[PDB]
From a paper:
CENP-E is essential for the alignment of chromosomes in metaphase. CENP-E specifically associates with unattached kinetochores to facilitate chromosome congression, interacting with BubR1 at the kinetochore through its C-terminal region (2091-2358).
This domain contains a highly conserved region from Xenopus to humans that is predicted unstructured and flanked by two predicted α-helices. Using this approach, we found that CENP-E2452-2598 forms a dimer. We obtained protein crystals that diffracted anisotropically with resolution limits between 2.14 Å and 2.71 Å. The resultant structural model corresponds to amino acids K2454 to S2506 of CENP-E. The structure reveals a tight left-handed coiled-coil in which the hydrophobic heptad interface involves aromatic stacking of F2478 residues. Surrounding interactions that stabilize the coiled-coil include salt bridges between the E2470 and K2471 side chains. The dimeric structure is consistent with the behaviour of CENP-E2452-2598 in solution, and is supported by previous data indicating this region mediates dimerization of the kinetochore-targeting domain of CENP-E2055-260819. The structure we determined is part of the coiled-coil on the N-terminal side of the loop and the conserved patch (highlighted in yellow).
Residue numbers in the entry:
A (entry chain A): 2454 to 2508
B (entry chain B): 2454 to 2507
The structure:
């Protein structure tokens, strides 16, 4: 019965580490994808200023 | 012992999901970070061209 208790605490720990990692993953995918969109706009601004400087 | 068996299985199942999630994260993050780094290089090179043009 002591083992059941230890196993259940280990189950609680491993699930919490699973949740923590999944939330960090989600956070970093979102921030990195937002950077991709931010730099897509920077690139658009660079093309527009370059067109006008050339014309 | 039956409950012990269920717990040990559940421990194995969760550690397996942890590894699976980790691998899928690392796959996607590396692809996206690659796009980010190519974008940064495009940006540097376009900025040079713009400074030249002006």
């Amino acid at each position: 019965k002591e083992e059941i208790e230890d196993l259940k605490m280990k189950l609680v720990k491993i699930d919490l580490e699973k949740m923590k990692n999944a939330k960090e993953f989600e956070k970093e995918i979102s921030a990195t994808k937002a950077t991709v969109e931010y730099q897509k706009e920077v690139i658009r601004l660079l093309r527009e200023n370059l067109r006008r400087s050339q014309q």
